[PDB]
Design a protein around this ligand. Structure first.
Ligand SMILES: CCCCCCCCCC(=O)OC[C@H](COP(=O)([O-])OCCN)OC(=O)CCCCCCCCC
Ligand SMILES: CCCCCCCCCC(=O)OC[C@H](COP(=O)([O-])OCCN)OC(=O)CCCCCCCCC
Lengths: 626, 395
């Protein structure tokens, strides 16, 4: 169990001048009395000891006497801190007490500078920095990593801590101080910078959204003065994700929207990504930057949202501009291919149906033999196509089954089609069950192409989740009653002769596919009637609770995301159509036009691949009219 | 003042738990006075680091180690409908979570032993006649009888200690009655088997159905399956009385019409069974076309079908109105209560061997009491991370 950081009720673990031990020293710095610190310096020199030794620190974690004073801050100032640092200098300690860190697994790298920032004591922050505090210390402990349970991930940096805790006075002091300035490009163990740390702590709540966005813009403007040449937003972590890409993967849509469309007028203009071109009444025309957004570049935001995002807001991020117009233009260019692929699959299903319809148990046989070849070649083409898709997008289908359940069905139909034609060559009779199942699955796969139509493309998740929940209860009811009916029939000896036949008989009656046999000739026909009556009544109550649970969830949860999901379905489709087929791959066409926005910080003309978006909103226009 | 007990032996903290006054129960459970009057508080803040807040909660008269604790009163002596909300308040949420994590291995071990017992129960009943095969079958009947008595003695021990909890909370402990009934049928069937009578067979197959249906009790250990039904059962018994009047009224007339001019309708029991099977889709209706008054039978059967449809229509409407209007999400709170009742009974242990209760918390000296004695309490550390409250206090 991790020890507490500061417990006023639990003593710290312990794992000729008068004696001044750790217990006496920890008590003095806790009460903030510099008068009783006398005698510590004479003790250290007498036995050649230092304040950073293991005797003066908690053995379990490594908390020093200096951090005890910072934890016990009285109205922002501790009178014991300044004498404590002076004793360390006079004692000749090779390692500075100010830069001391813990060694515990839970608290690793935690120093006194981290505590002073969290306690919101700028006077304590200035006092430590003036004495030689390193501002580039990493708190790489389990408590400071993002995981389940008790944790606080602030970026593992003192500068990142002040930004996440909304302390602009501490951020300003650390960034520009004569003693030791803080760089905005500092990275933690995960490679996250200060801007990367903000998107991780960001939340869709309006309070946290206002905190992170205001902190994000302030650091960019301050970073433009301290480091004009360095582009802070193009820095990537160990996963290769920029702060724009990192917000897309995690799903922080509120900051993702702000970064995607931001506009700064006058000064700090090159820090903006949306530039207004012209407006005429309700019509507003803006140029959106397509840097790291367009699908032409590798690992773009459009690919991350559609194939690397697990957040439930992925269908709302494809609606924000310029992602709405960009995916619409890509769909309009590839709408002809989508129906061309639908036409080729429909012709393949037509040939598949006719051959299976007209096969025996020489022009007619020669054309039938030619038909079997086209089925086999079509099956392998669908087989190789889905394996290529499965090799590139193995993780997307595992995290999103509802978005790509047809991809598994296209493989299964392809596997059954190829293997049936192989079994046909082996002259076995088992090619027929595989042929009719691929015929059913082949025709049922035509519903995938309904997303191209706006009426048919534009609830089911709730249904499937509840069906598997109540299926387990029904199987217990199905298995329990089936065994008793067989055991009652096997003894006094047939509709109930085995568990498989009894479970099938009861299941067919439930779905209205058959009837129940009462076993009137059996001696215990009353017991069978009692068991069959119990099964029917328990099933009705079980189905009644299923309808009530489905009724309560859909009525209470009111949401209209049919349009947003449909745009996401097109987004996943158009991104895969841009890659092309497996046998031939197209060359990606870059979207946007290279326009010179202005002058960058380094003096180079700020040329970006802007994308023109035209928006007409009468509601917002009438509000701004005097 | 707060340690004074009334004639029922209940402190003001325990009395609020039994009556169900959750608002004052929450305040007494977690209160903090700074500066003066500090020893009157039960929640002491240890340290805070951003959203993380760590507090030491007093476990006096709360931990299950002491007799007649609050955890026992809420789970076994409370009739208030807020009993599923009192197990969510701290430190009762973390205390019951730590007790569940320590006893999660036993719960699945008991589930495994019951599953093996049901497997042996099924095979023996599946392979019994109307010498290694018979010797193993005879050994199987002994394990069934010993397993039945073990379940019989276990439920009687539970029924002796918690007679009042099951009377006041049937929905929370309806499986306990089913475990006895399955145990009674299992033991009595093996006894009737020794008596060489043929009535051991109806009792054997009913215990086989009830035995397999009792495996749904162990679904509370899973968070997906453990996490409405009260409203359904309340309405079904309400509309059952109206249906029985409809069932009994039409059955007598059909028999009286058939008994006079004299068979699907020969007695009230057979007529009520025939009409009930058609309602649930388990059979068909006989029109008595050979009877002279076949038109009257058609009129009576048409009236029964139409009145039943209107009766079932009102039942669906009443169920639809109550669930839609009453909007509440207590699936998580009830699941924690189901685990709370289970972990409190697992702490007692089995009937043949009872464990020694392990005291939760650590004896920490909070400060100085009013009489001068050091205020040492069995505090319990609770770590809470709430980003929503932290961002509000930020200037
Ligand atoms: C190595 C050279 C091979 C050249 C073969 C050229 C065939 C044309 C290619 C084509 O039209 O696309 C195949 C089509 C697309 O599948 P999908 O993207 O809809 O899949 C999306 C799944 N999520 O899927 C189909 O139509 C089924 C495949 C069989 C078609 C046979 C040709 C028909 C000609 C009329
Ligand atoms: C006097 C000495 C007797 C010693 C017998 C030791 C048997 C093991 C004890 C055990 O595993 O617990 C029994 C189990 C618990 O019931 P429950 O708490 O789930 O009940 C909760 C009800 N609400 O319930 C069962 O598993 C069924 C009982 C029959 C089990 C037979 C042994 C199986 C060995 C594989």
């Amino acid at each position: 169990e991790p020890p507490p950081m500061e417990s006023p009720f639990q003593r710290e673990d312990r794992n000729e001048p008068d004696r001044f031990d750790r217990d006496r020293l920890f008590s003095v710095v806790s009460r903030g009395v510099p008068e009783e610190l006398t005698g510590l310096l004479e003790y250290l020199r007498w036995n050649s000891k230092y304040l950073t030794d293991s005797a003066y620190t908690e053995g379990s974690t490594g908390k020093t006497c200096l951090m005890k004073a910072v934890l016990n801050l009285q109205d922002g100032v501790n009178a014991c801190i300044m004498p404590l640092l002076q004793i360390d200098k006079d004692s000749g300690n090779p390692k500075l007490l100010v830069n001391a860190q813990c060694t515990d697994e839970f608290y690793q790298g935690h120093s006194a500078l981290h505590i002073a920032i969290e306690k919101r004591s700028l006077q304590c922050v200035k006092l430590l920095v003036e004495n030689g505090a390193d501002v580039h210390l990493r708190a790489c402990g389990r408590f400071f990593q993002k995981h389940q349970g008790t944790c606080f991930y602030f970026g593992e940096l003192p500068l990142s801590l002040a930004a996440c805790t909304k302390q602009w006075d501490v951020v300003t002091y650390l960034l520009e101080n004569p003693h030791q300035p803080a760089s905005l490009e500092a990275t933690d163990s995960l490679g996250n910078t200060v801007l990367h740390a903000l998107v991780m702590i960001a939340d869709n709540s309006p309070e946290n959204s206002a905190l992170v966005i205001h902190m994000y813009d302030g650091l960019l403007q301050m970073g433009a003065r301290l480091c004009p040449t360095v582009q802070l937003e193009e820095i990537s972590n160990h996963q290769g994700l920029t702060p724009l890409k990192l917000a897309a993967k995690e799903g922080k849509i509120e900051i993702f929207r702000h970064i995607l469309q931001r506009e700064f007028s006058g000064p700090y203009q090159p820090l903006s990504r949306k530039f207004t071109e012209w407006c005429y009444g309700p019509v507003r025309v803006s140029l959106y930057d397509l840097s790291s957004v367009d699908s032409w570049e590798k690992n773009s935001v459009l690919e991350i949202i559609a194939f690397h995002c697990k957040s439930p807001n992925r269908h709302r991020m494809v609606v924000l501009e310029p992602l709405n117009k960009l995916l619409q233009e890509k769909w309009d260019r590839l709408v002809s291919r989508f129906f061309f692929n639908f036409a080729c699959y429909l012709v393949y299903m037509f040939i598949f149906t006719v051959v299976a319809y007209h096969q025996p148990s020489t022009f007619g046989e020669s054309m039938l033999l030619l038909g079997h070849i086209l089925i086999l070649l079509g099956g392998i083409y669908l087989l190789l196509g889905q394996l290529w898709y499965f090799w590139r997008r193995r993780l997307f289908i595992w995290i999103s089954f509802m978005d790509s359940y047809f991809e598994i069905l296209f493989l299964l139909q392809a596997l059954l089609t190829v293997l049936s034609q192989v079994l046909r060559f082996m002259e076995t009779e088992w090619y027929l069950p595989l042929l009719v199942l691929s015929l059913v699955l082949g025709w049922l796969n035509l519903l995938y192409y309904t997303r191209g139509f706006q009426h048919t493309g534009i609830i089911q998740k709730v249904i499937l989740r509840d069906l598997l929940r109540f299926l387990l209860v029904y199987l217990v009811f199905l298995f329990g009653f089936a065994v008793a009916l067989v055991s009652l029939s096997r003894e006094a000896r047939a509709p109930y002769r085995s568990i498989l036949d009894a479970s099938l008989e009861l299941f067919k009656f439930t779905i209205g596919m058959g009837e129940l046999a009462f076993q009137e000739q059996l001696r215990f026909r009353g017991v069978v009637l009692l068991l069959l009556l119990a099964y029917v009544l328990l099933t009705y109550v079980l189905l009644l609770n299923m309808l009530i649970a489905l009724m309560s969830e859909t009525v209470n949860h009111v949401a209209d995301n049919s349009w947003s999901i449909w745009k996401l379905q097109k987004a996943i489709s158009v991104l895969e159509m841009e890659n092309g087929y497996w046998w031939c791959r197209r060359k990606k066409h870059r979207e946007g036009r290279l326009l010179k926005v202005g002058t960058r910080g380094d003096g180079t003309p700020d040329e970006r691949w802007c994308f023109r978006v035209e928006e007409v909103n009468w509601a917002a226009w009438e509000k701004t009219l005097p």
